[PDB]
Design an enzyme around this catalytic site. Sequence first.
Site, PDB file in Angstrom:
ATOM      1  N   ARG A 190       0.841  -1.209   0.000  1.00  0.00           N
ATOM      2  CA  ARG A 190       0.000   0.000   0.000  1.00  0.00           C
ATOM      3  C   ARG A 190       0.870   1.251   0.000  1.00  0.00           C
ATOM      4  O   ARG A 190       2.043   1.199   0.355  1.00  0.00           O
ATOM      5  CB  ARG A 190      -0.933   0.042   1.213  1.00  0.00           C
ATOM      6  CG  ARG A 190      -1.987  -1.042   1.235  1.00  0.00           C
ATOM      7  CD  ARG A 190      -2.838  -0.933   2.484  1.00  0.00           C
ATOM      8  NE  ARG A 190      -3.853  -1.988   2.570  1.00  0.00           N
ATOM      9  CZ  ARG A 190      -3.630  -3.243   2.976  1.00  0.00           C
ATOM     10  NH1 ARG A 190      -2.411  -3.659   3.340  1.00  0.00           N
ATOM     11  NH2 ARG A 190      -4.647  -4.100   3.008  1.00  0.00           N
ATOM     12  N   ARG A 232      -1.780  -2.926  -7.103  1.00  0.00           N
ATOM     13  CA  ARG A 232      -2.236  -4.103  -6.353  1.00  0.00           C
ATOM     14  C   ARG A 232      -3.304  -4.891  -7.121  1.00  0.00           C
ATOM     15  O   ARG A 232      -3.191  -6.109  -7.267  1.00  0.00           O
ATOM     16  CB  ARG A 232      -2.774  -3.712  -4.964  1.00  0.00           C
ATOM     17  CG  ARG A 232      -1.742  -3.773  -3.848  1.00  0.00           C
ATOM     18  CD  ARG A 232      -2.216  -3.026  -2.604  1.00  0.00           C
ATOM     19  NE  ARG A 232      -3.367  -3.654  -1.955  1.00  0.00           N
ATOM     20  CZ  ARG A 232      -3.300  -4.639  -1.058  1.00  0.00           C
ATOM     21  NH1 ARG A 232      -2.138  -5.154  -0.684  1.00  0.00           N
ATOM     22  NH2 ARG A 232      -4.414  -5.130  -0.532  1.00  0.00           N
ATOM     23  N   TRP A 241      -3.197 -10.262   2.181  1.00  0.00           N
ATOM     24  CA  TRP A 241      -4.596 -10.580   2.472  1.00  0.00           C
ATOM     25  C   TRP A 241      -4.720 -11.848   3.340  1.00  0.00           C
ATOM     26  O   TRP A 241      -3.812 -12.685   3.369  1.00  0.00           O
ATOM     27  CB  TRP A 241      -5.368 -10.814   1.172  1.00  0.00           C
ATOM     28  CG  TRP A 241      -5.547  -9.617   0.290  1.00  0.00           C
ATOM     29  CD1 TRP A 241      -6.417  -8.591   0.479  1.00  0.00           C
ATOM     30  CD2 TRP A 241      -4.877  -9.348  -0.954  1.00  0.00           C
ATOM     31  NE1 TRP A 241      -6.323  -7.687  -0.554  1.00  0.00           N
ATOM     32  CE2 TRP A 241      -5.386  -8.129  -1.448  1.00  0.00           C
ATOM     33  CE3 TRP A 241      -3.891 -10.014  -1.690  1.00  0.00           C
ATOM     34  CZ2 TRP A 241      -4.941  -7.556  -2.644  1.00  0.00           C
ATOM     35  CZ3 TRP A 241      -3.453  -9.448  -2.883  1.00  0.00           C
ATOM     36  CH2 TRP A 241      -3.979  -8.231  -3.346  1.00  0.00           C
TER      37      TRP A 241
END
Lengths: 315, 299, 315, 299
Positions: free
Chosen positions: B154, B250, B273
């Site tokens: 991120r 992403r 994740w």
Amino acid sequence: SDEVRKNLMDMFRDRQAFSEHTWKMLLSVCRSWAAWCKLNNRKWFPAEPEDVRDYLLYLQARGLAVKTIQQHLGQLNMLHRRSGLPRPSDSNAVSLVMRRIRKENVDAGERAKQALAFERTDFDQVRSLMENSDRCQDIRNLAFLGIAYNTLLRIAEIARIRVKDISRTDGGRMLIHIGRTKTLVSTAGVEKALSLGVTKLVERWISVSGVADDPNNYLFCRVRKNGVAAPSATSQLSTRALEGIFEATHRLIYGAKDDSGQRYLAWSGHSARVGAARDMARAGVSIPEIMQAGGWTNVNIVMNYIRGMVRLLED
Amino acid sequence: SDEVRKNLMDMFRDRQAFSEHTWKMLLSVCRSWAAWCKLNNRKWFPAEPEDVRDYLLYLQARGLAVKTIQQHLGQLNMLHRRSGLPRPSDSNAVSLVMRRIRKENVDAGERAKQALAFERTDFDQVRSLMENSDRCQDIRNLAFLGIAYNTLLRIAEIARIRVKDIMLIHALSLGVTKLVERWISVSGVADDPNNYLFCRVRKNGVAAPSATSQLSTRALEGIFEATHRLIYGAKDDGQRYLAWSGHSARVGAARDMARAGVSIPEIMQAGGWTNVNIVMNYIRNLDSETGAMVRLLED
Amino acid sequence: SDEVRKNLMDMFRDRQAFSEHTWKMLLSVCRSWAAWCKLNNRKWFPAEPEDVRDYLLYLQARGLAVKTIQQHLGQLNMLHRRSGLPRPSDSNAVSLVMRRIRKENVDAGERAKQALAFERTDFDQVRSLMENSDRCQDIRNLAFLGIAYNTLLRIAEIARIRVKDISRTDGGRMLIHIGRTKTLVSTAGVEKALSLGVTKLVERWISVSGVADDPNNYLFCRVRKNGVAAPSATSQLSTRALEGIFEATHRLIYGAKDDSGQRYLAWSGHSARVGAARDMARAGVSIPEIMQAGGWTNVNIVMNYIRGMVRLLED
Amino acid sequence: SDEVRKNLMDMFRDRQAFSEHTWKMLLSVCRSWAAWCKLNNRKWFPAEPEDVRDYLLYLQARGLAVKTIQQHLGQLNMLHRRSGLPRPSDSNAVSLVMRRIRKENVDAGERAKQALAFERTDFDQVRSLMENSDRCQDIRNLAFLGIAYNTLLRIAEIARIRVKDIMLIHALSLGVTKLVERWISVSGVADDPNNYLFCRVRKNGVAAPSATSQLSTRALEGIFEATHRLIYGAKDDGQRYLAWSGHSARVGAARDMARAGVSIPEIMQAGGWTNVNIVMNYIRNLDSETGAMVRLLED
DNA sequence: ATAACTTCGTATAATGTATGCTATACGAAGTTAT
DNA sequence: ATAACTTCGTATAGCATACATTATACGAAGTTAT
DNA sequence: ATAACTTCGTATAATGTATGCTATACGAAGTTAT
DNA sequence: ATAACTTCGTATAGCATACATTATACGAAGTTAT
């Protein structure tokens, strides 16, 4: 209050409803909390929100881990909730400081730890070294390590096995029935299959020890300095000794640990789980099957144990 | 009222219990809700159910997503729990309207959005267009894209990267490791280990390394946007995801990762994740994901 | 009571929180219940337990199905619970008679019914017959049947599709985005892939109808006796007409139904689901995948749709 | 007390809300609990928590399975819900003891039991031993076993089978269809379609078909037991599952069905299961079920 | 005398997930060096 | 002036931790058949 | 005039599961024809 | 007497349905561009 005295007396009288580890930590937290209250001229029972908040900050300042600080709050919450009283956590001053304690410590770099892995290569190595030993303690230890890796059972579960819990397959593979675990308490329980290799290691142990005299003897027992086993149907090989086997096996192969003081510098009771997980993932066993194998009815913990796109980025 | 005074003092004393981003949102929702209350002659605190209901409808009329309206209610609920007061969500009225507003907006065809893919096809095309450029910003911008694609980190994660943390970043490609080097050279970030890997580059063309200040995530989003405008010209004629942005690398990374074909828990651990929900939603419109019935019909 | 009047006025005012089908049945049950109370000189609101029990027995005696009797009780429970009142079901006289009504009817041979299956063979047959038709109604119908079988979507979901909900794959396969279903109401929703064959059938329909003039036109619309489509972005092809297509297609191939009066003598809105399920099972598609395909987040309903050891008993 | 009088009248009026088997169990638990109450000078109705707790411990001492003790509490809970009275299970005391009693009995090594398999090896062995017998009972007993094995039907299910329901039974094997015919002949059940397929056979050796009365499930269990005693002699030296019984054919059927290897949802729909829990427990000690780690270790 | 324990106390991991918290999005006002 | 950001406010997408226990981790002190 | 609808009302399926209900177990007392 | 059951009581293993909606099923009556 009378209700509080009765609610408390009812929990005590039926303490067996809870694990003895739950009881040991209830008292341990209570000592620690009582000690702090005494230092500070403070009433320890019905605990007062602001007093609890200060106590948690105190634990943070003593440099304790976030999960231990959570344990103290948890035991304090239980004591009150089962007394009929409100939880410290039911007040904002305590819920809020707990978040804060977590977020700050994490942000300062604190992280939960994991058992050093005991994997297939380790087992093969230890096995190739020890399987030539005729010492009875070596035969026990190899059989234990093998069950631990094979089944992913926790040390307390391995210690609770008795000879009569051991059945067989058509193929000759040993099956061990396990009643109680951390996550389940039923009369069905689960059953755990052993490979032919591990089965042999176990047979050899039974043969040299004489644990099969009584079907109610615990599979694993102590062995004294002269290599004579001491089977028992009422005292089990302690989980502390099971930890020791893991630690002795590591030392055998790698030598003495640092003097750093840190945990997880050698194999421990949970090392076979962390390692059998990694091995399955690495072998492309399905995520559901890994879960099936180590008693997990959900992903997460497996993920932490299993942790190069670069393969893809190249042509 | 003294028990709310204490509870509000509890909040201020242990404010570090919540991120500053949480606080800004709480504050933003409170201003909005107070403004409305005054405009409409209502008391903003404690929030009475009929007023919160009317306020939620007003937000619907204003044209906001169901998820936005949930944010306003949630912050209001928080404001009341961390006072001694009852959550407006626990009134029957507010419960009903939120069911209505949700079913009513979905009927009207409202849809969750998500980052316009930035995929191999796009990364190579950009590589081509500014690979043989000697401007610092072009060199920094290729490095950033490289990392974003290859790591799926991120943007807040990438702003905190420091050179001491470095190829392994506490795993990069061949040509991405080379590109991050060409930036490292021209930038001179290697000078303090505690410099951030990525730093500003001014109109003169010189870089300014810094251990105290990092590139804002807004700047990093800017690199994605500028790279889109470069190719496709001024952003599409007033809504969202008409150019690349933070997560674009992403989203696009996983699409190629699955289109190339590899285990989903391999994809998940790539991006960090652990709730397949989101990875599935990114990958979902790919021919490999078309399900058993397409496979059966095609035979 | 005032609270009751307000609680009721609050539900009414926000009726959109519920499906219009929920509202239609609330009123329908209320008519029926009001009618019975009137026959028997009985107060219909705050419903009285014993009055409700008698009413359910009355429905049993009218020969109604167990699930319809449950619908009446359910709507009556809702009305009261949301009024602030206790449920009829909260009383023993009503909970007990409901069990009894169920157990007795079942024991007398009553059984819930299922949609007659629409399977792959049926679709192939219908397709081979109708794909040569140039009538616009035939092209619509084939496209509908194909979507229904392909996606397992329910008729109300198929009717709610608009042109703009249709996207594409790299391969050229159509993808349809579905917001609301029976089980879910989210802005993410689900997306449904179409085979190349079904995709063509749909393209052909779009081409002959002219539904793609407005991206907000509903994919499916009516077609009048002269083969001219009537696209609309505000009125949809009714689920009753979608049922009719299924029924007309059955009649085309098999002729007219009995005069028995029974349901499920011809294909219906749910016939493609029952049939696509059966086809997947029969093809060895995994039980989880079947669930994935027809929106089911759990086994059961699949099992009822999918229902020779003899293979084994022979050598 | 009038509200309990009404509630008990509600119970008696709508008694068909529960099976007669449920009622017998309720009655049996009430007698036991009342007997204890008198012996120990306690009021049996309404059950006070401290007395129910003491009663549960007494049942533990008596040596009963956790599941049995759950039956006594459950029937007591039912007796109180269908009166207006609070469930004893909702007292804190009873909640605690049941946790204790459960953890305490599992510690002591109590285990759920289940039907001793009746498998192919056993069915063929029995076929051998009484295939060439002309006694009616032998012919009936082979037919029953055939059906039980091949269908996995429960014993209550098999007692209700009628000849009009018939090979397809509203699917049987080759040699099982032949064996049910040889019984049908000698029995003469085909005479009324509404006769039950299986009927008594008296010491004279003649069968007595009947449309009004069926073989009791106890008789059907008897066929399994007699078939075991025949081979292995007088039942094993005082506990459960030392011979075959009702479910034995069901348990043994699936074991071969999986040992032969076929999909588990194929097994489930065979026996009419829909909660794999039980099928897995029957099949669990088979080498095909030994899991990934045995597969990995053996390599 | 000592190997091989046991027992014990403080310390901390682990066991599943839903919606409450914390991220990114992005137009735009503010800031600073060129 | 303006490139190239940072700070901001408020929209919307997307994670992770509070909950109630139950288990292990490991040094240290006591134990007991050799 | 009528195909191809729409709208409508009663009737009924479907949507997931945990523990409350209903099965089997089995020693044994009772029953009836041989 | 007794084989060969049935009825019983109480133990223990093993399913399936109450809960709160939301959807379809289908005949019938009204509608509207041909």
